[PDB]
Design a protein around this ligand. Structure first.
Ligand SMILES: [K+]
Ligand SMILES: [K+]
Lengths: 429, 429
């Protein structure tokens, strides 16, 4: 039987702000993330980890015209065009919800697990991720008889893809064929689209990923996000809705043709249950500020569920009130769990943004690189690694420091050994 | 003694329309282009050629999720999503003015000729060109002691680059250090930008290419295109202005701060002469429909110049009238030459769009692959090749034909032998 395994992103050393804060705490950011990972693991929810990337990323600076040695390039950019430093030093890869789109073997035509890297074309600093993200996935899901990793879609606005963050999977047990729901923000020919915040996900992209992941045509549904919610701050579906098994926890203003979509899911998903949060109870604004929907909806063995939320949801009387009501109402959600993720939330990432859901059978679980599976040993090893290399204070100005560069290179080289990934980074090649 | 050599694009076999004409004539399109090439060569203007690309381009269709053999992929796309066929079968590479940005050795810090491939990120069908365009340039400008080809900038809207079409070079003799003028349509932070037709060229990209091409900082000027002209159809600078030696032939509504730009050129370029066409005489509309500014401004040995224009300029009484006046006025232009380029103009390409200007010293000219330099032998060989493989009629519907695919592959394989390029195309690797 298959279980849903969460793969979380280990915050990188250059985590920074580019709130009125300019000083970040990389070390604390990583520790907060590790704590969430460990807690869930300890509670019985399969957990794994995905490492940070090479930052600053000098290769793209060379692509931009700066030549010399890594340190000279860094110096030239610092002196001539320092704004690029921030753009090539983001710890954004930590939000693995955007790393790729997953298709469990129960939904594929060739019976293998498929993962398609997201190009993340809309944002320059995130578009840099794809190549390295592909290497990491291939080093983690290395067994080609069980896993199939596809390269990201062409890097153009027409095929903007933000991955799992806009993906959903509904059904009975995880191991059974499920219904996949792809949410997009825009499509060619459709005049209905955001007018203040461009849509990062296009239907053309979603459909291509569906194709690449060999998804059964009858087990896929494409739905357009409500354009008005996007203009309010919902840049990904995972900020206004989340799914798990037969449940779809969403805001009433989440989808363009919501009524139609839900009815369709009810007809196609056995026992499907939609939990819509009316705007009266919680507004879109409240949703965006608390990240109520960027929560993880987990399943226990008895069929009950747990909601993992960021601290902002508890600090908001209105949302907390709603959650306690939901807890007592007639539905699977029987527990609420809150985590302090201030560092990630400062840059726009909640509990779900930091994780990538991968349903794996018992045999597939065994095929995954064991060095990335969470347990006491990995937890302690990572914590020590963080205490050794991560700084407690960082600003954009420190990105020009050659020593930060050197520290990050050693750190990643040591981590690649710890996670048994080999020479997975560009600088190692 | 350096000369400016024109490298024209040989129209590909899939030239088609995706006016209301639906039937294209690939063969005629190629022959019209060859005729212009030959005429200029015969008149004494150094001329060379750049081959078409692999079309349909199946590899991108696979990236989009269609698997199987080349024929099956083609079949699946034709049946499932036929609109992709057109987007991967464009003969757009013919407009080599967008292939890359050139820096003559007289302007470079390392004394070599630099060529940076344009990403052409704005349009999906043209963004496919970069990789193959890079291989072709490296096979034509193969001597690395004389030429340096740099890969295209990252494929993101922030770094949209359309190449030479937005470039200009002013100065005395071609071989002397010249003043480079980079024209862009938008830049970050600048609220001044097109509002109807997105700007394909960003200042950030222009500046990066300037760096890649090792351009002397004092020999470069960045100027913003007038946003109002862009919204009227001027998607590239070579549709509203053209330079040559000490002359800059442009429309009065060409640049944002025109007065300041021209005064600056007057101060930095000896003998600089700006020929501004007032709106009263020729409107922007007239400009866009006739392609008056997408003309080639050539130099003869005595210092006189010749304007190479598309038929549309002669057919427009107003523009033709202005040209005759310009010919008699006090300036270097002493001759007008018109060519029939209806096929290319049908898709938005005039004489200049079909050519890439490369200033080369005598030694550099000798270093260029001799097999692509224009002469009677190459001219006759190419015309025969065209007659053998090009169809007289074509529509988007024919792009699904496996036989057209096979014809194009053999044609390109034979052409690669004729032009002594080796296995330069993906299908040959
Ligand atoms: K409940
Ligand atoms: K004249």
């Amino acid at each position: 039987n298959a279980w849903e395994v969460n793969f979380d992103g280990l915050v990188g050393l250059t985590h920074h702000y580019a709130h009125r804060f300019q000083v970040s705490n990389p070390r604390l950011a990583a520790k907060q993330g590790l704590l969430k990972m460990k807690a869930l693991a300890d509670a019985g929810f399969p957990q794994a980890v995905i490492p940070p990337h090479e930052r600053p990323f000098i290769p793209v600076l060379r692509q931009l015209g700066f030549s010399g040695s890594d340190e000279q390039v860094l110096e030239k950019v610092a002196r001539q065009a320092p704004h690029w430093l921030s753009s090539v030093s983001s710890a954004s890869p930590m939000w693995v919800a955007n790393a790729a789109t997953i298709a469990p073997s129960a939904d594929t035509l060739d019976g293998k697990v498929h993962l398609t890297v997201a190009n993340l074309n809309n944002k320059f600093h995130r578009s840099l991720e794809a190549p390295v993200t592909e290497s990491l996935l291939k080093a983690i899901f290395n067994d080609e008889e069980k896993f199939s990793v596809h390269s990201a879609l062409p890097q153009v606005a027409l095929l903007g893809d933000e991955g799992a963050a806009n993906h959903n999977r509904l059904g009975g047990h995880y191991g059974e064929p499920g219904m996949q729901l792809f949410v997009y923000g825009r499509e060619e020919g459709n005049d209905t689209r955001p007018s203040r915040y461009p849509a990062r996900q296009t239907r053309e992209a979603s459909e291509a990923v569906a194709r690449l992941n060999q998804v059964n045509p009858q087990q896929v549904i494409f739905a357009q996000q409500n354009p008005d919610v996007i203009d309010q701050g919902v840049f990904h579906n995972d900020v206004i809705a989340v799914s798990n098994r037969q449940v779809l926890f969403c805001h009433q203003q989440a989808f363009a043709r919501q009524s139609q979509l839900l009815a369709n899911l009810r007809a196609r998903v056995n026992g499907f249950m939609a939990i819509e949060v009316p705007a009266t109870q919680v507004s879109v604004s409240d949703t965006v500020s608390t990240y109520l929907f960027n929560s993880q909806l987990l399943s226990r063995d008895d069929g009950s569920m747990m909601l993992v939320l960021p601290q902002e949801c508890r600090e908001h009387a209105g949302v907390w009130g709603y959650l306690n009501e939901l807890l007592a109402a007639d539905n699977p959600i029987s527990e609420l769990k809150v985590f302090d993720l201030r560092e990630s939330m400062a840059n726009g990432g909640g509990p779900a943004c930091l994780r990538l859901r991968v349903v794996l059978t018992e045999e597939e679980r065994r095929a995954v690189n064991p060095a990335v599976m969470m347990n006491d040993t990995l937890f302690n090893a990572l914590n020590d690694w963080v205490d050794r290399y991560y700084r407690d204070r960082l600003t954009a100005a420190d990105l020009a420091d050659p020593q930060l560069l050197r520290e990050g290179r050693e750190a990643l080289d040591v981590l690649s050994q710890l996670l048994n990934l080999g020479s997975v980074y560009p600088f190692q090649r």
